[PDB]
Design a binder for this molecule. Structure first.
Ligand SMILES: CNc1ccc2ccccc2n1
Ligand SMILES: CNc1ccc2ccccc2n1
Lengths: 263, 264
């Protein structure tokens, strides 16, 4: 991988592995999400950066508020996929990281993703607006003119997601993270929540449809000793409304939507 | 990746990824196990397979009976590890796949692994001895003289593992696979069982020790709708454990194993 010529974005190639694919012999959406996260980590490393600056002194970190992914073609086992990523400031609201997925052989865009990140104190878990002096520290690594993976005026990445009402049509209860679900800081990896959401989709939908779009909001994290219930209701192509909540008190951890195309 | 000069082994390099590491910023044993499985798949693909034409006609497959891994140094996040793998027939008992892990920068052996595979009918799940027709078909891809990752006389890879007696010292109950735990054939990936075994090790041991050796026997598979209980008892500077995975309901054994950990 490497930064591009202007130093304002980063590209990296990946060969799809045997254990990274589903029953269609193409990369799962969780494998895609892991690759997006890996290229984001490599971009931050390449420019000297969690992706923290003088935020370390104040115990501040970037945390994901929303992840949105659209896949047109899932790469096959053994295929090479090229991913380009970049960041942009969204004023004092937070930051945005965008990605473009391409087939290396054809050069065709096979997917796109966007994510919204907010600044939070790692100890109190209190959010805060991005101040001047921290904004300037990473503005030199971002394009100044807007560059959006989802430009379309009125698009799926900015839709408001409603809260699923009980009773849910489908559910998968008692979900728990194991050590492989944790990152280097012992926190549950953001991609595990995508897996948990998908667990309540019936197997017949997975066997006859392909996931085209997933939008996921992150409200609160699941701790290593917490247990999660995954809830889904059809709202329709097939569309679903999703809700992840703690098994005990019913505390919301995530809400989302998925759109699936018939194969 | 590529086959070596004599075409009797396969090598491949991997850069350790950010999500592949634990709290020490080094590759987990499950990341290592996934890389061993990936290099085995690429070796089979490079020589045209890992079932032969005769095996597909008879609905026969290779299944893992035992996995044994020893790690001296876990590669760090961003490091390049080189893995060499090869196979050998073990007469009519089955096949053996071996691996050697090396640090690409130093060329030093940082790990080694060995696995035993048996031939089984895909549908009835009945094991069978390897016939001559099948044996000759893959012998042209294996070294003829013995080549062992674990040559030592009384080495840990061939030890008999006893069955853990109730009550277990430690346990993790209600373990279930999710879709990410399944392979392309919708079967639970062999590496998930390694994770499940390790789930019953206390966090204090993981935080103060490093896993040096793991030996795991595979008796039966966990189906997508099955639930597993993971059981561990200390058997021991070094710490050793006896492990047992069994179905949550009837207590049917799925795996048994041992781990050896050294103090950091
Ligand atoms: C992996 N995702 C998260 C989400 C929230 C966090 C809060 C404090 C520290 C780490 C965190 N990591
Ligand atoms: C991934 N491991 C296994 C173990 C046993 C199997 C039996 C039939 C078909 C596939 C199998 N896969």
């Amino acid at each position: 991988g490497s930064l591009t010529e202007d130093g304002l974005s980063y590209k990296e190639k990946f060969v799809v592995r045997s254990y990274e694919v589903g029953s269609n012999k193409t990369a799962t959406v969780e494998t895609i999400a892991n690759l997006l996260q890996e290229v984001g980590c490599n971009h931050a490393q390449s420019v000297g950066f969690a992706t923290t600056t003088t935020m370390r002194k104040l115990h501040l970190i970037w945390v994901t508020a929303r992840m949105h992914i659209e896949i047109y073609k899932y790469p096959a086992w053994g295929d090479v996929v090229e991913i380009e990523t970049w960041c942009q400031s969204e004023g004092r609201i937070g930051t945005r990281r965008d990605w473009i997925l391409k087939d290396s052989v054809t050069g065709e865009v096979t997917g796109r993703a966007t994510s919204k990140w907010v600044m939070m104190n790692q100890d109190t878990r209190r959010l805060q607006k991005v101040s001047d002096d921290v904004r300037d520290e990473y503005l030199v690594f971002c394009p100044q003119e807007p560059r959006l993976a989802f430009p379309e005026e009125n698009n799926r990445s900015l839709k408001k997601i409603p809260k699923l009402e009980d009773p849910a049509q489908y559910s998968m209860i008692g979900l728990k993270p194991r050590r492989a679900d944790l990152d280097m800081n012992q926190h549950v990896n953001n991609v595990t929540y995508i897996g948990w959401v998908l667990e309540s989709i019936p197997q017949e939908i997975v066997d006859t449809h392909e996931l085209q779009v997933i939008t996921l909001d992150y409200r609160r994290e699941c701790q290593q000793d917490d247990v999660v219930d995954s809830l889904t209701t059809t709202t329709s192509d097939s569309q679903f409304l999703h809700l992840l909540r703690l098994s005990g008190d019913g505390q919301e951890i995530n809400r989302g939507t998925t759109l699936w195309r018939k194969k």
